[PDB]
Amino acid sequence: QVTLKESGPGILKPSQTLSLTCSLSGFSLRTSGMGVGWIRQPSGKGLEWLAHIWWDDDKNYNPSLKSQLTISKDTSRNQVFLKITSVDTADTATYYCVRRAHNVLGDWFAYWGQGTLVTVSAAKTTAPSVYPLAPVCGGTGSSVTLGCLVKGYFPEPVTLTWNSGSLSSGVHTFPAVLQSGLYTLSSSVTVTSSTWPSQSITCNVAHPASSTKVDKKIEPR
Amino acid sequence: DVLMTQTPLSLPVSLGDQASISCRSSQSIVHSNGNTYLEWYLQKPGQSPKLLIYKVSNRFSGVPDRFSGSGSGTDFTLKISRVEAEDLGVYYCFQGSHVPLTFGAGTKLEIKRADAAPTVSIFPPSSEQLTSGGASVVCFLNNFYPKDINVKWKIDGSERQNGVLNSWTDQDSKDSTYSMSSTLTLTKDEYERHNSYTCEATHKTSTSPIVKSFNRNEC
Numbered sequence A: 001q002v003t004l005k006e007s008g009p010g011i012l013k014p015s016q017t018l019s020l021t022c023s024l025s026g027f028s029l030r031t032s033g034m035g036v037g038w039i040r041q042p043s044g045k046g047l048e049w050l051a052h053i054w055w056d057d058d059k060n061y062n063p064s065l066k067s068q069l070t071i072s073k074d075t076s077r078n079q080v081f082l083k084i085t086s087v088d089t090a091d092t093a094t095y096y097c098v099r100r101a102h103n104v105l106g107d108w109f110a111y112w113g114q115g116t117l118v119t120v121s122a123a124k125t126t127a128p129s130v131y132p133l134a135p136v137c138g139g140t141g142s143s144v145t146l147g148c149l150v151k152g153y154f155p156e157p158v159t160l161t162w163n164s165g166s167l168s169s170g171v172h173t174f175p176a177v178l179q180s181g182l183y184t185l186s187s188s189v190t191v192t193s194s195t196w197p198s199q200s201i202t203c204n205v206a207h208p209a210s211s212t213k214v215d216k217k218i219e220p221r
Numbered sequence B: 001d002v003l004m005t006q007t008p009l010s011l012p013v014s015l016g017d018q019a020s021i022s023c024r025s026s027q028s029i030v031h032s033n034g035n036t037y038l039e040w041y042l043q044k045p046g047q048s049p050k051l052l053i054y055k056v057s058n059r060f061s062g063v064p065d066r067f068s069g070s071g072s073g074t075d076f077t078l079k080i081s082r083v084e085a086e087d088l089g090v091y092y093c094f095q096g097s098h099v100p101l102t103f104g105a106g107t108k109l110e111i112k113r114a115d116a117a118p119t120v121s122i123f124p125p126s127s128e129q130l131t132s133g134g135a136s137v138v139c140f141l142n143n144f145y146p147k148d149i150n151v152k153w154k155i156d157g158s159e160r161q162n163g164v165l166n167s168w169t170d171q172d173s174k175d176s177t178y179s180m181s182s183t184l185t186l187t188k189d190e191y192e193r194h195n196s197y198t199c200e201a202t203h204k205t206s207t208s209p210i211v212k213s214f215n216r217n218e219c
Ligand SMILES: [Cl-]
Pocket: A099, A100, A101, A105, A106, A107, A108, A110, A111
């Protein structure tokens, strides 16, 4: 496997410097004419090419960022580095390391890293507040939908389960939204009228960055 | 910079049908060495993009002969015959000829299915949230098709557009529908200044909203 592995902070503050390392194996950046670079993708957005560095230490940069971008390599370690100075919230994205050689199994992004999420924010670490969403009594039917609202956390991610994982069918967990600079997430779960409230339905929320795990039983109104 | 303009941005298709995706560049992407470095990539949820086609028309390893790339100069086309489930995701064109290298905006290849009405559910703020001095009113619009449903909030008859945050699921793998969450967040104070809370979901070209409501003078 010719592989590329991104590593570095994951969380930074505005005005600080983003520094990422790409560790390579299965090929040599010494080979004429090998090249490695960086592409980023903001959440729910497209792909933006950033820079590329070559076996000969030639380098190409996206002019839209040239005052902020530096690419470099360590040939002896087989590593490539990205620096973005003076970052701001808009630099929040998944950052991919990619291989691209020239001159003739190259000239393609056949080989991509897995990507690493980098968040730029002034927010402090904050456990979510977990709120139950029980139906209006009565409203009203074959089905009853319940929910869980995970509000005001930082940073991503959280994980949510229903009834420790025995409720997997009919679950919809929605992508978090920023109501800034904290995240809010919701999840709905639908059961038959027979099921609830006769049996207890509970929302399990974990927030690894704040080593929080919380449950919240949906009690009827 | 060279602009890669991709058309269309959403491509619903039925399994077995043909899909065609246009990529047009703002300038020639013929490199000075005489090659055209035009690639197509496919990205599925939570994964890196994968290469499908390079130098306009060559299939990468593992890409079946149902995919073919064609074109020249500034006009390029990706064609997928007999679309399969494994083909669904977001397709990106790209030019590697001129710096800065640029991608098209993406085309989402998704499954067509029969129109489906949302199961709509409204939820007042919890007592827990209210004792912390907040109020969020949540509405789930679940298992509908197509993706572009419209949601509006009314408070005491007055439609309200501020403080509303929406979120969408990806297409469901089992029933090919979409779901959405709509959350109106208020100060506890403004929440308690009104009685009636309404979530109305209008698909498409309707006509007839599915309306869900509650009135605090009863809850
Ligand atoms: Cl390569």
